[PDB]
Design a protein around this nucleic acid. Sequence first.
RNA 1: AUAUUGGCGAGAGACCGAUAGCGAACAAGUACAGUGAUGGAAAGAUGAAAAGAACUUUGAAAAGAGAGUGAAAAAGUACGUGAAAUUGUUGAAAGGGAAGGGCAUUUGAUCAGACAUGGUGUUUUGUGCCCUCUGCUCCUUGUGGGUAGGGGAAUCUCGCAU
RNA 2: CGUGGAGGUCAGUGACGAAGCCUAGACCGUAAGGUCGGGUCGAACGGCCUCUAGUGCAGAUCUUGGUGGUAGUAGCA
Lengths: 125, 173, 267, 125, 137, 385
Amino acid sequence: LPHPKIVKKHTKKFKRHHSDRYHRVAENWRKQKGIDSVVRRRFRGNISQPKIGYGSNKKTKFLSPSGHKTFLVANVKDLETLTMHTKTYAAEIAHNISAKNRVVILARAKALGIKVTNPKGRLAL
Amino acid sequence: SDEIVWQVINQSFCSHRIKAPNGQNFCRNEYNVTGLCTRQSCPLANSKYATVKCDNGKLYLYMKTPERAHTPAKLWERIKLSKNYTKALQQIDEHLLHWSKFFRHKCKQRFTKLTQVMITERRLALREEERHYVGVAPKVKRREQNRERKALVAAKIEKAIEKELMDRLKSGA
Amino acid sequence: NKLKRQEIFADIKHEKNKERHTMRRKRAKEERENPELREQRLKENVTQTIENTRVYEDDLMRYFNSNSNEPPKIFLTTNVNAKKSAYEFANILIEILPNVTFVKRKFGYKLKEISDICIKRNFTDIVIINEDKKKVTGLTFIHLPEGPTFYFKLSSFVEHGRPTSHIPELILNNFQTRLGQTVGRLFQSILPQNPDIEGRQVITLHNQRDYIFFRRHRYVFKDNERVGLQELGPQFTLKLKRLQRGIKEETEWEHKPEMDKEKKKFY
Amino acid sequence: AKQSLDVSSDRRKARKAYFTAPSSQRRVLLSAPLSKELRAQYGIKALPIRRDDEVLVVRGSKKGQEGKISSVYRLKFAVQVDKVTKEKVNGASVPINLHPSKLVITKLHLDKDRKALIQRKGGKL
Amino acid sequence: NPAKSASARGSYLRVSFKNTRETAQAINGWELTKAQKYLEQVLDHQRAIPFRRFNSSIGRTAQGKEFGVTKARWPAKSVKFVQGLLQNAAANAEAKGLDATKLYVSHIQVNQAPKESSPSHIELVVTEKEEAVAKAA
Amino acid sequence: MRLLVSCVDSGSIKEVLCNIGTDTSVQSALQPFHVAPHLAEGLKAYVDRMWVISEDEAILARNSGVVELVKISKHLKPKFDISEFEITSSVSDLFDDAKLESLSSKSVKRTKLVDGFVTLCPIKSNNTFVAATKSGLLHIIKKGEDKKLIKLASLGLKAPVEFLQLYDLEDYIFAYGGEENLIKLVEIDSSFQSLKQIWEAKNVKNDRLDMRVPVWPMALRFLEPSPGKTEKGKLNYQFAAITRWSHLTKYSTQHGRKPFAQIDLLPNREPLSQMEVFDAKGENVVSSLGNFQSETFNELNVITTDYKKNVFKFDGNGRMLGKVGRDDITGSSTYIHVHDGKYLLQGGLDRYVRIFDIKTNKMLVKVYVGSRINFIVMLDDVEIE
RNA sequence: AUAUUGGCGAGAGACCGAUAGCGAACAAGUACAGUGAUGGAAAGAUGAAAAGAACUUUGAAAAGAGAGUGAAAAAGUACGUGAAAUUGUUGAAAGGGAAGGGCAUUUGAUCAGACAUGGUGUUUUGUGCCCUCUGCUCCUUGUGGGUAGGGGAAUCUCGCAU
RNA sequence: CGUGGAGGUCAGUGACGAAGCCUAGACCGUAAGGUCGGGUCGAACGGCCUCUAGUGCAGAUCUUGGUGGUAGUAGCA
């Protein structure tokens, strides 16, 4: 699909303050609640915080580098909902699907022209 | 009626929706034109509804009349659509006379894609592929790991060559 | 009752080692005086390994396999759209096999259409290497007329030898089974029948299980009944599959996981 | 579906009742079906199992193998069929614990009370 | 190569851990015949073990000059466990059928055990030293 | 029992002499009394097809081009009686490799493309046999009064042939076919000079994909003609066939030229071969040429073999009736035969003779031969003391 | 008719799931502590079956090494999954009286990176659901559906194969 | 946005490997987090529309359990 040049604004992950120093403090983002915190008062040098400005362009949101929107698929029935949106959406074969069923899904998605984001998953030659 | 059917499935459950991470909604009711679901693009909310499907290679165009709201057994009236593309789009047009321009070009569009799904035959005539997907079951992944590591230990390759060089070049002296 | 169980069996294990070896120290002392008493123990008491407990023509030689009459030309190809590691692997087969031509395989020419070319160009064998991902996985030797064809699986490749241009001597191990000696037959055929003695290069094909290991070495003879050897060439493990009998149409063995259940047999 | 108020559909009560069952109740719980030949003769589906009767093993690794029951190990809910034996590493023989639902009786051991048991259940010896 | 190797292991051994670490790394990468002779010399106060990490209040001696360390000690008990394992690994190698003269410890490793006590696991892996080579024009 | 096991790697006949319950794979089990190699003529001249005539006479056909009449004679060697084999007559040069090498310009896959015999059977107590090759040749080899084989007439058919089956249900006619060759019925004259194609099959309507359905029939068996009012012009010949594309196809000529029911037996169009006929209770339901003796397709039960390792059983409606010796057969199956209606003869590329019971699906005999089998016939099943 | 945290015996739960739930899912009011009244824990899971590692060998013992059973010991009576702190070994990198962080980049190491292969317009033929001859069958309004027997390409791209 | 359980639904996923655990692996979401590949595993589990609560941790000289530096130091009369 002819897509716009996808701008990301912030590629780096918004890690927590002192997530790296201490081990018990997780890298998952939590706001600094204390009034005397430098991160909360956004001092120069300190880590950047997640705010609404970093939000992605509506036209190019949810899009993978291929220019397709991601879409989970369990079986051949859920796969065949994207018979009309091959250029827009891409089949993401779910993690828990067996190797026995994937060979079936990949056969159909290849025929319908649906780009699968994760082929070669559990499947040798 | 049908507005009351829509609002009750728009929220309050259309029990065949797929919420994609894109926030998009997909009706998997086999009879819808757009795989996506929206008002009068899904076959339950709307009362007049056309669709192209395939049961075999024969591509039929199903049609739903509000006359048959009483009887769900014979809801979808269906017509075969020749096989040549040009006469089929013309075949489509006559059925869609005096309808929404939605079903007019969208059944035209269903027919287009489902005919270029018959690129399956192209893949299956020029198949002859020496690959075929093989599963890697994690039991086999260790029957063929931990037994090779047990092979090498009992193998003693060095001692085997050391024997069958001396045993060779004594007899080939 | 884990807390009871833990102490009881730890003490029993402790008790058993004392008793096991006090018996053995008395065994040692009676063996010092009489050597003969030890001899009878070794007869009755057996180590009972897996090998000990295994659960149990001339026209062919030429017609299905290549002999010492011609130089055998081996048509080395690769599975379509392969990457660096496959050609890196082809460079290891470019040395070891006698007269290899590498053919870049460009989509189509299904399989029989290939056979038409290698009849005209007059090749003897076809070998094809395949890749699922970045690692090499499968190796397929086919004989061009008639078509005895062998499939193989590689689970080991690790890389200080650096060999000469001299041609290596063959050696095979443990092919009692008739299906084993038909694979032994393939590697007798497909590898060179030249051995130039000097240059001192040996290629092995050891098969103590259903797994076959091939290695290269350098042998140095000292007159005191011993020979030394250094590691050289590619490390390797193969698994036999299929024996497709026709070019690809028929089967003779085709590995299933219905074996491994026996823990023995070994084909 | 449960209709009676006397019987319980509780898992906890049912598993306890089974594992803390006495030897007499375990005799009935260790019942084996009869082969199609004996079912045709005697006109009965299943019986409790004893010693001096023959049996054929239907399900398991020892599939199709037959023999004669040595001892009903009621404590371990098991039978031990003679000539269905796993050979230990020291050369000794240890019997496999089979379950009587997996077995099938081929040749019964008719005693007086056994004859009466058949006649009670609608049999014709 | 597992074919050119033998390995002894002692577990839940009632030794001082910190002493065992020093006497393990003192003997690491050495030929087996030189190694066993060295520990006999440590027992008779001819040579001393170089202590590097766990080395507070160790008396400074001249014998540490071999290893470029000021501090060194003669730990009898820890060495006694190690030469017991090395004697075992020597017999393990001769069980497989390795050469005794070309034998050297490649990987010797010591880590703590369940506990108060301070017990320790020791494992050591001996290896052949393979040279044996020639060429031709 | 006594068997004639056709070997190819040696190019001979190995003779199996054993009992029921014989197993060569287990050392503590019963052994066969005598294995016997006979007429070793190399790999270039292996025996394609045979026919047992009587107690002391059996015809052969070799892949060098030679059809041979061989005399059987018994003598002593506990208390067992081994056989001697002597070539009395030989009619040679019956292949035409030029036709097959010219036609198959990649038909499917064969590099050597060897011409072999597809049948060896009697025309009718006649001393008169027929032999057909893959190159469309048919030779009417008659055994003379002086016990010497003479060729009456060589006949021509549309290549390539794979099977040829005669019709011995009076109530001369035969049928034949191969790769992209339909089933065509040909009537022979009593003089054996004239052949006339009375009927030709039509391929079924296209699949989902509108592709042409592949045609490669591998074996045919006849049934007794359809009952009721026989239509004029339309012939009365009920028969079934197996393809290389899993199609169990059933033809009633009274119904039409197209087969009334094509049934995919296995998925993914797995290659199949050798249509045998058996009965579920272990009974003889067929003639000497294996043709089913009934007027309905629903009574028919068939055994067929793939090229992976399997031997299948199917009814008249393509329902799967269980595999034959799933455990023991590790290689392919070159030849199967329903002997007496209560025994199965089997032996393929794994190089073992197997005798299966029809009723209980139980393996009776396992004999190592050391050579690839392509043909087995049972002489008798009388026990040896 | 009513009460009921005891007893005897049941039936249940939008309850808890081993630091929870009773103190106690187990040699629990036990071990143990207190002169005594009393106080009072910790601690569940090998496997399908012990098939619990025979036998050779290293040591007075403690533990190892070969070898084997099992689907898996990458399940060993320290026994399902086996997290983090922390410890050793190996490999890589850095270190002149501080490190870790943010913006940006180089170098070193390293991982991704199509069983993607056509699309269109003409031309040989060969087939079919195509033309044509003869039909049969489900039902609702014309703008229906399914399904046989023959023939025929010298018209026809209508489709699919070359 | 997430967690335990309930009703409903996806004729959902699942010994051809569910849940969990890691991972110098990849993608999405400003973020809460979600999804996927690889490795380990062995039996159940998830999305969706709703319900319900003993529901989200860095601290409390927090409670419990485990493990360090101190340290082979003071020390053993």
